[PDB]
């Protein structure tokens, strides 16, 4: 019940929340239908449109008008945005040259340069080129602040997923927000686009940014608006905002537009109708600048131009249907589109199984533009497994497509021609970032980032401590002028044990073999100096990395790579290695294929054993430091120590063999020379995060040698390639990946062909972040670098795409 009774007389726009039944005037009462009975006529005004006339300077002031050019506007701060320009001989911000921020410039009173975001549905990242001509005012902001060629969303590239994560600077599987629609089992409800129940507290997660302000003592406009409120009136409610008294004035305002998505998802990305909506965006960003200028703002406010996501070409006739591959497709529920997500649709009917679901949606059509997974074996780098609301089943859909149910889902539900929501790495789905004001830079590019990164910086710019998030604090420093974040390295939580030479080889026990009994004091020296670390420079680069939690473990020294190996999880938690451009590939002697050899610097107990991978007949073995890459014929024996094996499927060793002895030496021919770190993931409970020992689910069978869900690599070199990896004098270059350590190639529907056709289209799927592999080791890389320590967390944050260019 509301009773609407009750009147907005100087409440237009109120701020503070007022609660049923208590009639309500503010940005969001008619998505409530909870308006006072004149919030039409009082707040949403429209005579006389949003623009001053030459006939109207000196007006006598009418109430009534939308806006005023009357004299006393300026004072009452509710002239039309272009008085100044009409009535008072002003320029347009637009064509004024642009002039370097170098402190702001603000009016007493104002404690800190406010902060305005102006947000954008749909904003493909390149239409900041491809529409530029059209848009001057985005053209301006773009040249003259701080911009990237792109920013990535997050998955699923859909709205409200994007702006919470926005918001937020969580991943949607923190924050709740997994798609536009969703059930939660727990609470058994439904969340739809459509509605009331999107609005309960209880489905939003993490902290927003209008939150986190609040709490800290700092004022924030409400940052949504009803569809109705048309975007001048969004402007100058803005406006009217920034001209309340000091202690009432917010810090931070949001403006949203639905333009160019909602044309877009009628035209397609580049249909002629765009033009329109992108010239239509342009002028309310002029409206904005105009107005602030008005108020002598325009060189206080920092302003964000932001987007959610981009828009690809789909149209009804590439829609794929379950029915055409499922016998059973009544007893689904699908949330269907530009991503699949699959449930039961009874939870009492036992005679479902994901298992024969997955298989009957498994490569079974030669051009098949989907691809099924359970939610555990999607890409790390989607960070979409860990929240209820998303269902164990996954359909990546190819860009340009659908997927469907059944066809008259499609029909009795062509109109759309634009969609979005695939993979966050298609370009396609990229979207836009400008920053413009005294805090951020001038006339500076930076590189593509990730939107998860940004409300560490709105907290930067607000002074405000960000809420526990997915950022990376201080990976974006490089895009301010002052108000950096300075963090400090993590300190080490472990330190190594080093241990020399032991145990006799007859300790042993490990059923295992090596014909490695063929017999120098020249040498002898060497190969002692080797053991403790003499060649540890070329091979450990960048520092050995970090371990952030308590464990025992053992730095292992060897000519050609160093380890730490974990007497837990009695395997290296990593392994590096550097291969010169000049590296030559050898193969494994014919007498050495199945040889491993007991190190004698790691107890018995402390080691795998060979009996463990002989008995279990589904597990096999594989090695971190690849014996392919030996600098000489003597040190190839070091790489078939107990302490270099990990556990393998057969399926995935071919994957991981055609990595080790064909692309790694690929990319030092590339790169000049490269520096691999590789080790294991235990990720079972799929929250992207490293896994304890108690959380292991399976062991090689009979012992307690973990199994790994995935296999990393961070392959890292000289940013100048004229300078090989072990010799570079500036900033790095990195590419990573993790794994999934699969029991079949079923992902991979060419498998069956030469691992050259299929093996680094797979690896470039589940390309990574050193973040991401940091979160799932516990481990901190890179830190003993000449680089400054944001420039060193900047290439943690970086995912190499594989994507041409923008
Ligand atoms: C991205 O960044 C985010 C933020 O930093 C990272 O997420 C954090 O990770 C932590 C570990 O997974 C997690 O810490 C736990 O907090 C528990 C209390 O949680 C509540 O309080 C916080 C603070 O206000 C709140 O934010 C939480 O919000 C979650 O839950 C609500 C729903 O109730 C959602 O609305 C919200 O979206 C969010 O959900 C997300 O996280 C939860 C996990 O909390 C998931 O279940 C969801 O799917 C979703 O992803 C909560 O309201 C606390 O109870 C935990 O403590 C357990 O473990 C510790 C060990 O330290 C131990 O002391 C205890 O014994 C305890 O174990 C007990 O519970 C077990 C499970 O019930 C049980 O098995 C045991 O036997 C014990 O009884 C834990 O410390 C933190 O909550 C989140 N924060 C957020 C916002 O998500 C994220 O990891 C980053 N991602 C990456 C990849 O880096
Ligand atoms: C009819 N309405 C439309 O068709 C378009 N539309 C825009 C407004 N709206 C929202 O803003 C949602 C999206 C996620 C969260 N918003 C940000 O999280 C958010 C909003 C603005 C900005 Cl500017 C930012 C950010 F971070 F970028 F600054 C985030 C709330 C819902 C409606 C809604 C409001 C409040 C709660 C629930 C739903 C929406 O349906
Ligand atoms: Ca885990
Ligand atoms: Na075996
Ligand atoms: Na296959
Ligand atoms: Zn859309």
Redesign the pocket.
Known sequence: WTATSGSCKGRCFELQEVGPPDCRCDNLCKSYSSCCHDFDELCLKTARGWECTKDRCGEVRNEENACHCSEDCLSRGDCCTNYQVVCKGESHWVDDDCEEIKVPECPAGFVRPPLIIFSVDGFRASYMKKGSKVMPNIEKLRSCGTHAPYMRPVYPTKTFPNLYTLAT???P????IVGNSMYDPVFDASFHLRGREKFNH??????PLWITATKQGVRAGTFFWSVSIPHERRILTILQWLSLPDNERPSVYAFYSEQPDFSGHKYGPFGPEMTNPLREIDKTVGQLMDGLKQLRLHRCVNVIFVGDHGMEDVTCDRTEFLSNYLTNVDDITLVPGTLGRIRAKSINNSKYDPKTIIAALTCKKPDQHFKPYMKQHLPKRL?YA????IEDIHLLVDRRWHVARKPLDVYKKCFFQGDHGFDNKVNSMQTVFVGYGPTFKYRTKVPPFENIELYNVMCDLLGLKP????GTHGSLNHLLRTNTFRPTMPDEVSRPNYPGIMYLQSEFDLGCTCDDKVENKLEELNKRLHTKGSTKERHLLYGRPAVLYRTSYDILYHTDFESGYSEIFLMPLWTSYTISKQAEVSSIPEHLTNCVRPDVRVSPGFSQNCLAYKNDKQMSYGFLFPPYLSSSPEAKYDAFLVTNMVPMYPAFKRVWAYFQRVLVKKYASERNGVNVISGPIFDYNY???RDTEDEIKQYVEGSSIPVPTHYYSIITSCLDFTQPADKCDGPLSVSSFILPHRPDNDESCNSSEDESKWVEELMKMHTARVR?IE?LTGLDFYRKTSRSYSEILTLKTYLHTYESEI
């Not at 599987?173 to 709740?176: K, M, N, Y």
């Not at 809420?467 to 997915?470: E, G, H, S, V, Y």
């Open positions: 600077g969580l991943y599987e923190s924050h709740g209880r489905w939003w997660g993490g902290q960070h860990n929240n209820r609301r809420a526990p998030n997915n929250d992207g995060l991401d979160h």
